[PDB]
Design a protein around this nucleic acid. Structure first.
Ligand code: SF4
Length: 393
DNA sequence: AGCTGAGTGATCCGGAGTCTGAAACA
DNA sequence: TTCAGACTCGGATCAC
């Protein structure tokens, strides 16, 4: 029964959280994405020890290097048989921009070899049928996957009852009024808030509190937690004064220009005849097409439209207001000889934390309601990632 | 008692960032 | 003013 009270109090903290920020991050509602499960497995391979934008870029580089011949559609966008028949050198060169490329490429090749010598064709849709316990056991039975990876794959793709704790989640849960930094032990004397490394097996002390909650609740909690950690709780100087839990974050009680490059531009309606070469935008994005201005023009495209959805891990790599830069439209921008359209801001930069540092709360709210973020570029022809043009940031 | 052994504890893999201290000059 | 080396988004070992 005492277990019950703890569970209830945690449920309450979560509810206060998922709501309080819901007035800031807009609508983080569940939206399904296409794609097989092997896409998720390769993605969780790829994002093991690298930042999110770099991992997404490496994944799309893999996708464009070997695209599936093509005309929740659980069909892999990458012809993994080609990678099975490929060589280690070239595939490591494919993700050379990520690091660890030899090691990761070898691990991917070993995983694919294990799969094919197990049951022939490359397929894991049947993981959706077995009980979650045995599926979790078999996924963990692989090499190169710890517990965080399998928990993440299960929760965000197979919709089980799981909670992956990345660095942000552990830091957040140890720094707020939630579980302290002394779960099993008793420090009781530190006299500072240095946040020395406590990203570890704490889950045995946290998972019991999160045994019985809704799946959508856990999905939204994870999504909003990671974006909130990206924007508000950074390892170096959080904008703690501006966090709505300033009256509740335990760390805040201890004490009490070149980053952003924005251009006020106009968005593109979905029925503009000059956009006929732009993949025929799909209807499941709150945000729309954008155009960057300096007779002159340069277009912007949303991420989900650019990739046709079907991104691994249900597309949690990307922010809600995240757009791509068309490489062709950047190399030789189009001359379009348009003022009465609504004016919107682009907030260019290089990552999520870099752009949002130093900003006041109202500016954050504005850029989440009628704002946008872009940190990279994209080529329509080869469907591959490319470095961002230096003409803006 | 004299050999486990459990568990961590460093350390690794590796590009691209940024951040930060020294130097330098006043 | 430079700039250069340190540090920052897990899973294998391997030593203790
Ligand atoms: S109150 Fe400040 S330090 Fe605490 S989580 Fe919010 S932004 Fe971070």
């Amino acid at each position: 029964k005492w277990w019950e009270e703890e569970r209830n109090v945690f449920r309450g903290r979560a509810d206060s959280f998922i709501a309080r920020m819901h007035l800031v991050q807009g609508d983080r509602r569940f939206t399904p994405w296409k794609g097989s499960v092997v896409d998720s497995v390769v993605g969780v391979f790829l994002t093991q020890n690298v930042s999110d934008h770099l991992s997404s870029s490496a994944f799309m580089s893999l996708a464009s290097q070997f695209p599936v011949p093509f005309v929740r559609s659980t069909m892999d966008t990458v012809d993994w048989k080609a990678i099975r028949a490929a060589d280690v050198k070239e595939v490591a060169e494919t993700i050379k921009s990520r690091g660890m490329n030899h090691k990761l490429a070898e691990r991917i090749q070993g995983f694919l070899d294990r799969l094919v010598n197990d049951h022939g064709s490359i397929d894991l849709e049947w993981l959706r049928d077995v009980p979650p316990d045995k599926a979790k056991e078999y996924l963990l039975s692989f090499n190169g996957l710890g517990l965080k990876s399998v928990e993440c794959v299960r929760l965000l793709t197979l919709h089980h009852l799981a909670f992956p704790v990345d660095t942000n989640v552990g830091r957040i849960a140890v720094r707020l009024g939630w579980v302290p930094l002394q779960p099993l032990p008793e420090s009781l004397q530190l006299h500072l808030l240095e946040m020395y490394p406590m990203l570890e097996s704490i889950q045995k002390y946290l998972w019991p509190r999160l045994c019985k909650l809704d799946q959508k609740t856990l999905y939204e909690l994870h999504y909003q937690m990671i974006t909130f950690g990206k924007v508000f709780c950074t390892k170096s100087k959080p904008n703690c004064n501006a966090c709505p839990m300033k009256g509740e974050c335990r760390h805040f009680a201890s004490a009490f220009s070149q980053l952003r490059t924005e251009h006020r531009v106009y968005e593109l309606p979905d029925e503009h005849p000059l956009l006929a070469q732009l993949e025929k935008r799909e209807p499941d994005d709150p945000c729309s097409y954008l155009l960057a201005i300096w007779v002159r023009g340069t277009i912007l495209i949303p991420c989900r439209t650019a990739m046709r959805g079907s991104f691994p891990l249900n597309g949690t790599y990307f922010q809600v207001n995240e757009v791509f830069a068309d490489h062709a439209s950047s190399l030789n921008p189009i001359n379009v000889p348009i003022w009465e359209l609504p004016r919107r801001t682009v907030y260019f930069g290089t990552s999520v934390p870099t752009i949002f540092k130093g900003l006041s709360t109202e500016k954050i709210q504005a850029c989440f309601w009628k704002g946008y973020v872009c940190v990279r570029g994209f080529d329509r022809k080869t469907r591959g990632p490319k470095p961002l043009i230096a003409r803006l940031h």
